[PDB]
Amino acid sequence: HMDTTITQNQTGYDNGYFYSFWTDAPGTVSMTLHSGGSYSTSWRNTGHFKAGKGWSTGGRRTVTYNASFNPSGDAYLTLYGWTRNPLVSYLIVESWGTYRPTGTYKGTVTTDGGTYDIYETWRYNAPSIEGTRTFQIFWSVRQQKRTSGTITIGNHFDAWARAGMNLGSHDYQIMATKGWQSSGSSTVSISEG
Template sequence: MTVHGVDATFSAEWNDVEDFLARVGLDFNQTQKHTQIGTISAEFAHTKTEEEGGFTYIGIYGWTVNPLREFYILDDWGSEKPGGFSSDGTPRDEVGTLTADGETYDVWKKTRVNKPAITGPSETFDQYFSIRRTARTCGTISVSEHFTQWEKLGLPLGNLHEVKLLIEAQFNSGTVKFTTAKFVVK
């Protein structure tokens, strides 16, 4: 991964990986909920290449603590759109839908048991996914709107640890370049 030094722009390349993550963005001190920090949004534009197979996620990624939660807001993906199954083939629970930035997102939840997390190598935590129905390579993601709507759907969040632009890939090769990557907190 190469960070370009302008806002959160970066590029990354991966080759025949089992699991690859590259992310740039905001770090927090785990003492405040999103409502105490302000309204968070991200502007982005990217290009990508990818071999068939495996999966690729592109969007927002982060964690909260107390409760421990891992979250994804996916606005783009590789050859296969993510949905009701995790990369390990186990099902996710469908929670509902939300509307943000003029588009509908499907919301999923997955409880992970004895998995690595930011707090240790063997934790139990929930993952939340907002998956845009139509992929896009540029735009604005209203991160706080997803947080608010998740909570209305019964998906509680804790104190923020991080909110970052993400590329995650498994079992494939490819490249991504974020030519625009900017976070705004108001």
């Protein structure tokens, strides 16, 4: 009869929603899982972390979200997901803190009232859904920040494909808070369509 609080690397289900939690700085960050599609995070002088709720069946859905996003430094509010064969992680970054991600620029996609820059990067020997690996990351980064709205994910997937950024078969997909060597808090509420 209390909200579950996650502090150790794991995935699972809470109140019908898939969740994922990962950090390399255990004890510096927590995720509290609320009723429905809502969660909060709190972090203090963390290392790296990524945490959120969403779906173990990733794919071309529409995600509507509303968030309080309060980073004191480097953090993102981002849809975050994975595919296998090829192993790819992807991020649709809605807001950021002191640092806006960048990478190999592929063009833009205009969707959901915003224009997003498309980037691809490689991440070297890093944690993944298939162990510690090098893998590509596909990015859409909103040209300006927002903390609520709708993400029409298929429009991003289609733009990435046109840019030669090829996804594999879907694994999970979450509306995440991500942090790097910062402090802060977030609360995020989601729904699918």
